[PDB]
Design a protein around this motif. Structure first.
Motif, PDB file in Angstrom:
ATOM      1  N   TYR A  12      35.618  33.126  44.863  1.00 46.56           N
ATOM      2  CA  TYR A  12      37.007  32.655  44.724  1.00 46.56           C
ATOM      3  C   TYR A  12      37.655  33.144  43.417  1.00 46.56           C
ATOM      4  N   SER A  13      36.956  34.018  42.690  1.00 49.25           N
ATOM      5  CA  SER A  13      37.365  34.439  41.335  1.00 49.25           C
ATOM      6  C   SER A  13      38.858  34.812  41.242  1.00 49.25           C
ATOM      7  N   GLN A  18      44.451  33.134  39.923  1.00 48.28           N
ATOM      8  CA  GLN A  18      45.800  32.758  40.362  1.00 48.28           C
ATOM      9  C   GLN A  18      46.201  31.385  39.803  1.00 48.28           C
ATOM     10  N   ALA A  19      45.275  30.426  39.863  1.00 49.52           N
ATOM     11  CA  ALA A  19      45.502  29.091  39.298  1.00 49.52           C
ATOM     12  C   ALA A  19      45.848  29.173  37.804  1.00 49.52           C
ATOM     13  N   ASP A  32      47.895  38.067  31.663  1.00 49.53           N
ATOM     14  CA  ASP A  32      47.481  39.421  32.055  1.00 49.53           C
ATOM     15  C   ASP A  32      46.279  39.373  33.014  1.00 49.53           C
ATOM     16  N   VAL A  33      46.206  40.335  33.935  1.00 51.75           N
ATOM     17  CA  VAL A  33      45.147  40.355  34.958  1.00 51.75           C
ATOM     18  C   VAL A  33      44.233  41.589  34.834  1.00 51.75           C
ATOM     19  N   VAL A  34      42.917  41.352  34.875  1.00 53.31           N
ATOM     20  CA  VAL A  34      41.915  42.431  34.847  1.00 53.31           C
ATOM     21  C   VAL A  34      40.734  42.114  35.785  1.00 53.31           C
ATOM     22  N   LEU A 130      39.833  22.788  36.736  1.00 52.37           N
ATOM     23  CA  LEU A 130      39.344  23.131  35.392  1.00 52.37           C
ATOM     24  C   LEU A 130      39.940  24.463  34.899  1.00 52.37           C
ATOM     25  N   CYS A 131      40.007  25.460  35.786  1.00 49.43           N
ATOM     26  CA  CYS A 131      40.549  26.786  35.438  1.00 49.43           C
ATOM     27  C   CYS A 131      42.001  26.690  34.943  1.00 49.43           C
TER      28      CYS A 131
END
Length: 154
Positions: A12-13, A18-19, A32-34, A130-131
């Motif tokens: 689900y990473s 996204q959360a 930022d996304v990586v 939590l995320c």
């Protein structure tokens, strides 16, 4: 701001990321996304240079750990000082080489987030809760610190 390292394919990473990103963008910042387990290329490292003020790392899967070996070296050269590293637990199943790297975060003393201990293996709805919360909370550190505190009158 704040580079979240995730995997669009494995587990689900991506949804966890996204959360984090949406929770903070909804507030009004920008994350930022990586892809640590997919799009690992120079283009990601390039962004890590400019966005180096904050990072976020989830679990370390053996399959992905093999693709991190090279980029990790470049990362050690870019990151420095005392920036943020959002380490969040989400899957009880790591690879041994992780501890040597954890020793680096420990010794160098980087700004770590809420440390949990082994969440089974499969990320649950709790993991999202939590995320988002921990991610936003970490962002609240970066914003106040990098906004020079009294740089904005209110």
């Amino acid at each position: 701001s704040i580079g979240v390292f995730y995997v669009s394919e494995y587990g689900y990473s991506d949804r966890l990321a996204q959360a984090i990103i949406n929770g903070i963008t909804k507030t009004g910042v920008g994350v930022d996304v990586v892809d640590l387990g997919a799009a690992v290329d120079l283009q990601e490292l390039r962004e890590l240079v400019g966005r180096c003020t904050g990072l976020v790392i989830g679990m370390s899967p053996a399959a992905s750990a093999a693709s991190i070996q090279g980029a990790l070296s470049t990362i050690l050269g870019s990151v420095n000082e005392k920036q943020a590293v959002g380490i969040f637990e989400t899957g009880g199943g790591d690879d041994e080489p992780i501890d040597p790297l954890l020793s680096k975060f420990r010794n160098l003393g980087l700004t770590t987030a809420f440390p949990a201990i082994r969440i089974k293996q499969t990320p649950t709805e709790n993991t999202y809760k939590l995320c988002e919360e921990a991610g936003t909370d970490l962002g609240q550190w970066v914003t106040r610190d990098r906004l020079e505190h009294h740089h904005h009158h209110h």
